[PDB]
Amino acid sequence: SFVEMVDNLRGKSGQGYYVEMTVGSPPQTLNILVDTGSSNFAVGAAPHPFLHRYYQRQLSSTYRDLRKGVYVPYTQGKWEGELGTDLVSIPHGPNVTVRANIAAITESDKFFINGSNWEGILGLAYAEIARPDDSLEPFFDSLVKQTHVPNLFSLQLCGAGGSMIIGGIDHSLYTGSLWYTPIRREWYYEVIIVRVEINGQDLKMDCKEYNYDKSIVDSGTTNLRLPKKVFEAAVKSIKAASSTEKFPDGFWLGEQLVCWQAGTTPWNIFPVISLYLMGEVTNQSFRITILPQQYLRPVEDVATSQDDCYKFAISQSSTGTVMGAVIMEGFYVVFDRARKRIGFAVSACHVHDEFRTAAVEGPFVTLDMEDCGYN
Ligand SMILES: CCCN1C(=O)OC[C@@H]1Cc1cc(C[C@@H]2CS(=O)(=O)C[C@H](NCc3cccc(C(C)C)c3)[C@H]2O)ccc1O
């Protein structure tokens, strides 16, 4: 019965993908950002310039105050509020109702986005990174304990809406085979990258550099973020491959956006990036290939024209590798919590390049993959 959940997501990689939910009795409708990069369920509970609606605890008869404060600092943006519990449901999700923890946001800073269309956030990662501490059971954990919903979900983010299949895998949302990588540790959705190639060229770095100090799958992050050393190597390789044309130094920093005559974007000059992930069997891995149409996020024409403009969706990180929404977009991603693994398959709503195609290929042989994990 996953068909009811197909296409239940809206938004983009820039402002975030969100799903509709209801909290309290009577049910209060709110759009909630889908974030596999955090573990707190929180909604605006007070007026805000960017909010068109918010959670009103007083109007809910099922609301319960936990008499405890909470705050959450994200890489960018933060909020604080009061903890409590209330009945929660997902209209275009499993037909169930569960009591989960809810952080009523009373104050925030650079958290809500103007015009994003969402007023809350659904942290889908594990309790280990929940605030104030791992005692605050995350939404998905509550859902799985209180109902018969299987312990797993899948995300199909489509750039250029999308689907969040709660409790299973919808075989009609992807093509080819699903390839699985182990979830290294249950806190963020941590994985291990064992090799990286640009246009078939191996970056030739100590694979530990790829996972320094970790690598995570974050639907709540827009770009592909890479550790300093890896970012520099990647940019250097991407520059050479596209040396045909020159771009502002600010462009490679994700500041300036490059434009081209409507339909003249030189995709061919931009290389494909292949990230190899640790597999399920000894010395085995697989790779996902990212096309330029993925790491070149399209943006509105800053001018008064109508030319195709984009922003370099690859940026430097100091908190490890982050496989964000722009990476997830070409693929169907299965967060198989039950079997502690993450699956990747070519999405039905994949990118359409002329002579190239985003892919998930295997199997590959890779020795000493364990040494790729950072400690
Ligand atoms: C798809 C579009 C996503 N977006 C984005 O990147 O910036 C704006 C936009 C929407 C948006 C998303 C988030 C979720 C954050 C984003 S982050 O870029 O901050 C990485 C972090 N996950 C990793 C992380 C990093 C530090 C601390 C924590 C704890 C909460 C466990 C977790 C994640 O939860 C918070 C506020 C927002 O306005």
Residue among 82, 173, 184, 101 at smallest CA distance from 140: 101
Please state which of the four CATH numbers 3.40.50.150, 3.50.50.60, 2.60.120.260, 2.40.70.10 is assigned to the domain occupying 150-375.
2.40.70.10
Residue among 302, 241, 293, 299 at smallest CA distance from 265: 293
Q: What is the 8-class DSSP label of residue 92?
A: T
**Does residue 35's CB lie within 6 angstroms of at least one atom of ligand 1?**
yes
Atom of ligand 1 nearest to the CA of 77: 36
Beta bridge partner(s), residue 72: 79
- Residue 111 CA to residue 44 CA, distance in Å, equals 10
- Residue 74 CA to residue 62 CA, distance in Å, equals 29
Domains 17-149 and 150-375 are alike in CATH topology: yes
CA 335 to chain centre: 11
**Does residue 260's CB lie within 6 angstroms of at least one atom of ligand 1?**
no
The residue behind tokens 């890896």 is 230
3-state secondary structure of 177: strand
Q: How many helices (H) and strands (E) does the chain have?
A: 4, 25
Residues 51, 32 contacting (CB under 8 angstroms) = no
Residue among 180, 178, 193, 367 at smallest CA distance from 282: 367
For 113, the enclosing helix (H) or strand (E) is: none
**Does residue 129's CB lie within 6 angstroms of at least one atom of ligand 1?**
yes
**Does residue 37's CB lie within 6 angstroms of at least one atom of ligand 1?**
yes
| Residue nearest to ligand 1 atom 22, measured at CA | 37
Q: What is the 8-class DSSP label of residue 369?
A: G
Beta bridge partner(s), residue 20: 31
Atom of ligand 1 nearest to the CA of 123: 34
3-state secondary structure of 105: strand
Q: Which residues of 46-82 are buried (b: 16+ CB within 10 A; e: fewer)?
A: eebeebeebbebeebeebeeeeeebebebeeeebbbb
| Residue nearest to ligand 1 atom 23, measured at CA | 37
Where helices occur in the chain by DSSP H, the ranges are: 139-146, 228-241, 292-295, 325-328
Give 365 Cα–ligand 1 centroid separation in angstroms: 34
**Does residue 279's CB lie within 6 angstroms of at least one atom of ligand 1?**
no
**Does residue 108's CB lie within 6 angstroms of at least one atom of ligand 1?**
no
The residue behind tokens 């191996």 is 202
Resolution, given in Å to one decimal, reads 2.2
Give 74 Cα–ligand 1 centroid separation in angstroms: 6
Residues 301, 307 contacting (CB under 8 angstroms) = yes
**Does residue 321's CB lie within 6 angstroms of at least one atom of ligand 1?**
no
Residues 43, 105 contacting (CB under 8 angstroms) = yes
Q: Which CATH architecture has domain 17-149?
A: Beta Barrel (2.40)
Is the peptide bond between 363 and the residue preceding it cis, with omega within 30 degrees of 0? yes
Provide the residue count of the chain.
375
Atom of ligand 1 nearest to the CA of 129: 31
Atom of ligand 1 nearest to the CA of 218: 22
Task: Kindly list the domain boundaries of the chain, sorted by start residue.
Answer: 17-149, 150-375
3-state secondary structure of 220: coil
Give 76 Cα–ligand 1 centroid separation in angstroms: 6
Residues marked active site are found at 35, 218
Using DSSP bridges, classify how beta strands 16-23 and 28-35 pair: parallel, antiparallel or unpaired: antiparallel
Residues whose CB is less than 8 angstroms from the CB of residue 259 and which lie 6 or more positions away in sequence, other chains included: 301, 302, 303, 305, 307, 308, 309, 310
For 21, the enclosing helix (H) or strand (E) is: strand 16-23
- Residue 281 CA to residue 182 CA, distance in Å, equals 10
How large is the C-alpha radius of gyration of the chain? 21
- Residue 271 CA to residue 156 CA, distance in Å, equals 24
